[PDB]
């Protein structure tokens, strides 16, 4: 509706109503969403991921990283007034801003292998933040990264500082990336800070035909 | 969540009127055609009617056409069906129930059942 | 009206087993190509709920033990392995053309 096909796949808050759809034939999304990127940021081949949606009818969502099982780091905290779901200020669904435990962030090392027999679309993403100060605030480290493996991805990001202009209030940037992970391929993450991590990821159930619609319309009870 | 809460049990004198409700909540009400489902106690599930929020259009069952009358609150996010002059034959169990898309459609979330009782 | 009859009307499976019920259309329930048949299980004491639709695809949060197969006039809902949380009455119930027909409904019973 008023939300994005960005919106949906990360899971913006107030895109709740899409948190887990059955097969459809094609996607309509309006000209500009009001429910997009809560918190400003960009999406990373973005046009290329919708162009492989036109493909696709139907996700399963599954769980490949739980949110409850990150020890060492705080996951309940990663949360912005950027995103509000009612009031109480919240954050994307599918992916967890995880920030220091005790005064401190060690390296995380975590891997998920592909043992479903279809592909796999995951997402994640990294934090620019607005200074060196609120970069030590958040995560400890100054000098931070995130490196992400498969048997064809070679990615290492490093989070970019600038001042820039407030966007739903938020000076800082969120960015976020994805693959495909072939079954029996595994993905393979590390960071020492800024990480933005997977909870849930995208079976592709089932592929064919469709198309991503432009319109102000909505459903017609027709066929 | 998709909750469908709906109307509590009821009793109704022969030759009466009931009027169950069914309040959606979760999902948009003006997207999904709401349904009604007869159930004669452990036995067949029977196909009442449909009805569309957005604009109120209503869709029966032959056998239900006259007794039966869909309704829908907009503001209220609220369907409605209402039975007119029952007998013993209406003792049953009404669900309240979204079908997903259409004529062609499969019923995805089912309410708890409002369960009516026919006798003087 | 597309009269839908189930078959058989109650089924006794031992644990660890394969279920097998059957769905009989009148006429066809089979256009565009797609089934539009549905199965439904009503675990005992409450409202029915959504396993199969268009008569081969689980709705989501639906264990791969059901499996949907069939086309055109008849059907099958194949349940295996058989657990214990899986006595309920299933129902298979058509949407190819109003009025919206369902089946008898088929009461499976756990030998143990």
């Known amino acids: 509706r008023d939300c994005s096909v960005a919106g949906w796949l990360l899971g913006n808050p107030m895109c709740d109503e899409f948190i887990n759809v059955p097969e459809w034939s094609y996607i309509v999304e309006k000209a500009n969403p009001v429910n997009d990127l809560c918190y400003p940021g960009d999406f990373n081949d973005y046009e290329e991921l919708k162009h492989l949606l036109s493909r696709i009818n139907h996700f399963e969502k599954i769980q490949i990283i739980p949110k409850s099982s990150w020890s060492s780091h705080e996951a309940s905290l990663g949360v912005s007034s950027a995103c509000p779901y009612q009031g109480k200020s919240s954050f994307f669904r599918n992916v967890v801003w995880l920030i220091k435990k005790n005064s401190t962030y060690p390296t995380i090392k975590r891997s998920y292998n592909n043992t479903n027999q279809e592909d796999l679309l995951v997402l994640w993403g990294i934090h620019h933040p607005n200074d060196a100060a609120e970069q030590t605030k958040l995560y400890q480290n100054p000098t931070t990264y995130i490196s992400v493996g498969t048997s064809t991805l070679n990615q290492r990001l490093v989070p970019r500082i600038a001042t820039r202009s407030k966007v739903n209030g938020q000076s800082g940037r969120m960015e976020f990336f994805w693959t495909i992970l072939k079954p029996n391929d595994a993905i393979n993450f590390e960071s020492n800070g800024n990480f933005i991590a997977p909870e849930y990821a995208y079976k592709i159930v089932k592929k064919g035909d469709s198309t991503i619609m432009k319109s102000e319309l909505e459903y017609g009870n027709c066929n | 969540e998709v909750h469908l809460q709906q109307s509590g049990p009821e009793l109704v004198k022969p030759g009466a009127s009931v009027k169950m409700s069914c309040k959606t909540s979760?999902?948009?009400?003006?997207?999904?055609?709401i349904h009604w489902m007869k159930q004669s106690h452990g036995k067949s599930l029977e196909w009442i009617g449909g009805?569309?929020?957005?604009?109120?259009?209503?869709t029966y069952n032959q056998k239900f056409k006259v007794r039966a009358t869909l309704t829908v609150g907009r503001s209220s996010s609220t369907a409605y069906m209402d039975l007119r002059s029952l007998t013993s034959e209406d003792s049953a169990v009404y669900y309240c129930?979204?079908?997903?898309?259409?004529?062609?459609?499969?019923?995805?979330?089912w309410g708890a059942g409002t369960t009516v009782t026919v006798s003087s | 009206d597309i009269v839908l009859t189930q078959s058989p009307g109650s089924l006794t499976v031992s644990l660890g087993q394969r279920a097998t019920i059957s769905c009989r259309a009148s006429?066809?329930?089979?256009?565009?190509?797609?089934?539009?048949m549905h199965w439904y299980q009503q675990k005992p004491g409450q409202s029915p709920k959504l396993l199969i639709y268009?008569?081969?695809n689980r709705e989501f949060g639906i264990p791969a033990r059901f499996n949907g197969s069939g086309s055109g006039t008849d059907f099958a809902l194949t349940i295996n392995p058989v657990e214990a949380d899986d006595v309920a009455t299933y129902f298979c119930?058509?949407?190819?053309?109003?009025?919206?027909?369902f089946g008898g409904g088929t009461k499976l019973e756990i030998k143990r």
């Open positions: 979760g999902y948009t009400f003006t997207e999904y055609t």
């Open positions: 268009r008569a081969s």
């Open positions: 129930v979204r079908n997903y898309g259409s004529s062609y459609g499969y019923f995805d979330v």
């Open positions: 006429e066809s329930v089979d256009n565009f190509g797609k089934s539009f």
């Open positions: 119930q058509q949407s190819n053309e109003d009025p919206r027909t």
């Open positions: 009805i569309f929020p957005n604009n109120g259009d209503t």
